[PDB]
Design a binder for this molecule. Structure first.
Ligand code: ADP
Lengths: 231, 646
């Protein structure tokens, strides 16, 4: 638990504009899809948006992904296909739009990290949902002698003061950084022909060695072409 | 020079200059279209208006752009609809008079000159959608898209009034023209005095037709983060009953704004006006998506002949019909058409081929009493994820004329029919159509077929079997049909399919219900290496040179030949499956029954084989079936059967 993952979620859901941070439970099924309510003075019957309709073209941070109700899981799986949430409830037949990006943070099975236990044994999620994520991480927690002094001098160096870095670096202020990244999104680069050969041969490598194991061991099968589109 | 007070128009320049437009038009719209029949349009279309007796000429707007002069009249038209439309009406009538003085003995000249002719323009731009519209732009012309939810009943409108007295008795009458109707207090008989009572007999006067249709649109290039929206529009006389519940319509009309009362009791007209549309021309057919059937339409084929209207069916031209009879002579049509469906997804040509055969569905035979046999076929496809199941469903959702796309765990037993609700603008109890009545004729789609309830999925035992729906609750006790071609998909427990495990076990369905579906695919993955090179070369073929080129080598792909090919293959063919194939068909069915002692085979396989077989015979323009081609109609199940060994 102590790899400080919530700090990054509050962080990047504070740098990006239009970024919504929702915990596990938390929002209901109707809280993060839209609902219908009567409108005062201007009329009438507007679809009041939920969490996901609020934060589109942004980043939707999510805590505690395992504790979600299963209807919310199918909502997220409908966000994994683009643009689409479809509703057939008592007064709605619509197909609203959502162009969001999802960052999740799921915990393993209790307690932590048994190398006796297999992968996906300590994971409470199906490998289809592992295939919908093109990039998957894991943050271990192993006691090690050398890093502890750097970590202790790091943390106690900030409770001692209020700024961490030194020798030789200054942190970029976030407003100028948002000006940089906001400038960066107007480029649309174009690929070429040598990168065609290199991407193809690398995909032959990953496809080739990924399917010669075929086991429930520490290997993760079977390197779907979503990794190719993701890379 | 004369002018009108609200505007800058003049009657002379518009009249003479538009008269100068209707006598010369030589494909300048092609001079913008870059050229890739030399006689002008409106003499031909004015003759088609002339001999057939139909009214209602209609023209485009880009045609008014392309000609020079009258580049000016377009910008006059887009701003000022009512006055300019009245002017074009007057000069059309005088153009008919200026034609009839050529032969002098034409059509009993008085009444056909007397009959009202009118203009319906369309295609007047589409820059910004419904949301952006400022109150600066009140009265203009607007294009919209999107479907249609419900349809109010007919309400009349007074055009003529009618008065009497009790003394003694004389019967004057009065018109409307502006907003109000004045009535006299005195007199008739004597006129003058006495000031007798003036009654109104409201069973004698003229009336009109006013129908209100509620709409929901899909305004592309969204102003993020926009949510969907609802407009209400108010069609008039001729266009009554020109819109069902479900179609995809592109509308022109005039944006209006009229205040409403408060609480029906005082005269306090509330501020903060209400907006609506006031339609002019309805555009149902289209040239990019599919075209509607004919066995469904036949009630409104039986109607709509007494009163002249719009076409509702794509007009098949004559020149390219020769190209239809040319492409029908191709031998490789059975892999060419199935190859040309989804040119961005590349496997599963049996599945592409079955999706082609869902568009040619069966033969509609009606008996004397009972029977009522449709051409429904129904396809499941499952297997491992990351297999582009969704791309197929979005593409079919684009092509289908009346498709509705639900999902799993977003349904209820209420959620597919009878949304009996409270409409706000009239404050009564109005009944809506749910999710399958909108699906009536066409293709539905359902994702995650595993994760329904028991209550939901108990709807489909009626729709798949009886081809009815039986609503019985407090609103309406009356069965109503929803013919539909259900397509669905499901993801297994694995999620990878593992061998040496029963096929029925790996998807959580009761195998009678899995046995009820016609064509069941099981798409799995191969660990070999040779295909993946061509796979990645297709992907990086798509990403490169930032232009849609996707498949041009070494292949010919029709762009929009296939939609009119399918519709022409849907009206003018009735295939019959007579004697000579019953030996092979019954022979193969009893051969299928041989396996006994996983999945089994019932009579739905036999019904499946005849309807899929004659669906193959609907292709390639043959009014009878042959003993040959039934074999691959068996092989479409046998490919899955070879995919059931593992
Ligand atoms: N490398 C690190 N640097 C600074 N603080 C850390 C580090 N690793 C762990 N922590 C501490 O561990 C805690 C982790 O808790 P948090 O990130 O809020 O949720 P979770 O326990 O789910 O990760 C943080 O409060 C943080 O103070």
């Amino acid at each position: 638990p102590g790899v400080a993952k919530s700090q990054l979620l509050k962080a990047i859901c504070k740098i990006s504009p239009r970024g919504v941070y929702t915990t596990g439970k938390g929002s209901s099924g109707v809280g993060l899809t839209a609902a219908v309510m009567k409108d005062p003075v201007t009329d009438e019957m507007i679809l009041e948006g939920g969490a996901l309709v609020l934060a589109d073209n942004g980043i939707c941070c999510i805590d505690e992904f395992d504790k979600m109700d299963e209807s919310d899981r199918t909502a997220i799986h409908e966000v994994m296909e683009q643009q689409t949430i479809s509703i057939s409830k008592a007064g709605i037949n619509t197909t609203l739009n959502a162009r969001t990006s999802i960052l999740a943070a799921a915990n393993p099975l209790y307690g932590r990290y048994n190398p006796r236990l297999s992968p996906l044994d300590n994971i409470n999620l199906p490998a289809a949902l592992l295939s919908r994520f093109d990039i998957l991480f894991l943050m271990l927690d192993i006691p090690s002698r050398d890093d502890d002094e750097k970590l202790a001098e790091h943390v106690t160096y900030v409770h001692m003061h209020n700024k961490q870095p030194d020798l030789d670096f200054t942190p970029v202020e976030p407003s100028k950084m948002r000006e940089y990244i906001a400038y960066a999104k107007t480029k649309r680069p174009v690929m070429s022909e040598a990168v065609n050969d290199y991407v193809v041969q690398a995909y032959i490598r990953l496809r080739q060695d990924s399917k010669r194991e075929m086991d429930s061991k520490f290997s993760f099968g079977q390197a779907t072409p979503r990794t190719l589109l993701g890379i | 020079l004369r002018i009108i007070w609200g505007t800058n128009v003049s009657i002379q320049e518009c009249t003479t200059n538009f008269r100068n437009f209707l006598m010369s038009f030589k494909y300048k719209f092609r001079k913008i279209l870059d050229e890739r029949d030399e006689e002008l349009y409106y003499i031909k279309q004015l003759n088609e208006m002339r001999e057939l007796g139909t009214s209602n000429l209609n023209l485009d707007a880009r045609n008014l752009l392309a000609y020079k002069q009258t580049e000016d009249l377009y910008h006059q038209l887009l701003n000022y609809p009512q006055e300019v439309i009245s002017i074009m009406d007057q000069t059309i009538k005088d153009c008919m008079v200026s034609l009839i003085v050529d032969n002098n003995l034409d059509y009993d000249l008085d009444e056909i000159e007397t009959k009202f002719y009118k203009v319906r323009p369309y295609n007047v731009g589409s820059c910004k959608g419904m949301r952006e519209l400022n109150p600066n732009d009140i009265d203009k012309l607007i294009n919209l898209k999107g479907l249609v939810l419900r349809s109010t009943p007919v309400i009349p409108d007074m055009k003529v009034a009618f008065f009497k007295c009790n003394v003694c008795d004389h019967t004057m009458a009065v018109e409307i023209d502006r907003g109000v109707i004045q009535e006299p207090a005195r007199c008739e008989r004597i006129d003058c005095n006495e000031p007798n009572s003036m009654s109104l007999i409201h069973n004698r006067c003229s009336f009109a037709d006013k129908q209100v249709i509620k709409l929901q649109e899909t305004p592309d290039f969204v102003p993020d983060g926009q949510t969907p929206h609802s407009i209400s529009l108010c069609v008039y006389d001729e266009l009554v009953d020109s819109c069902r519940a479900g179609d995809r319509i592109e509308v022109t009309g005039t944006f209006r704004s009229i205040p409403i009362r408060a609480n029906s009791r005082q005269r306090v007209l509330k501020s903060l006006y209400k907006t609506y549309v006031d339609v002019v021309h309805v555009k149902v057919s289209d040239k990019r998506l599919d075209v509607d059937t004919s066995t469904i339409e036949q009630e409104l084929m039986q109607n709509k002949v007494d009163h002249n209207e719009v076409e509702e069916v794509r007009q098949i031209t004559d020149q390219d019909l020769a190209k239809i009879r040319e492409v029908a002579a191709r031998e490789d049509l059975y892999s060419l058409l199935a190859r040309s469906i989804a040119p961005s997804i590349y496997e599963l040509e049996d599945v592409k081929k079955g999706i082609l055969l869902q568009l040619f569905g069966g033969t509609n035979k009606t008996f004397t009493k009972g029977g009522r046999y449709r051409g429904d076929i129904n396809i499941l496809l499952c297997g491992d994820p990351s297999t582009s199941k969704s791309q197929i469903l979005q593409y079919v959702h684009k092509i289908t004329p009346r498709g509705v796309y639900t999902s799993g765990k977003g349904s209820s037993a209420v959620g597919l029919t009878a949304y009996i609700t409270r409409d706000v603008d009239t404050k009564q109890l109005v009944l809506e159509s749910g999710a399958l009545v909108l699906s009536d004729g066409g293709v539905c789609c359902i994702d995650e077929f595993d994760k329904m309830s028991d209550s939901t999925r108990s709807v489909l035992h009626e729709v798949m079997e009886q081809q009815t729906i039986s609503i019985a609750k407090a609103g309406i006790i009356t069965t109503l049909n929803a013919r539909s071609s259900i397509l669905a998909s499901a993801n297994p427990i694995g999620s990878r399919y593992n061998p040496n495990l029963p096929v029925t076990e790996n998807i959580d369905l009761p195998p009678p219900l899995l046995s009820r579906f016609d064509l069941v695919y099981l798409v799995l993955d191969k660990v070999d290496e040779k295909n993946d090179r061509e796979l990645a070369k297709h992907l990086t073929n798509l990403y490169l040179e930032d232009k849609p080129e996707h498949i041009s080598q070494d292949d010919v792909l029709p762009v929009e030949f296939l939609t009119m090919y399918i519709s022409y293959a849907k009206e003018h063919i009735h295939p019959i499956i007579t004697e000579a194939a019953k030996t092979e068909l019954v022979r193969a069915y009893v051969g299928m029954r041989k396996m006994g002692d996983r999945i089994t085979a019932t009579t739905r396989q036999l019904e499946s084989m005849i309807r899929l077989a004659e669906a193959h015979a609907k292709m390639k323009l043959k009014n009878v079936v042959e003993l040959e081609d039934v074999q691959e109609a068996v092989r479409l199940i046998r490919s899955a059967i070879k995919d059931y060994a593992t």
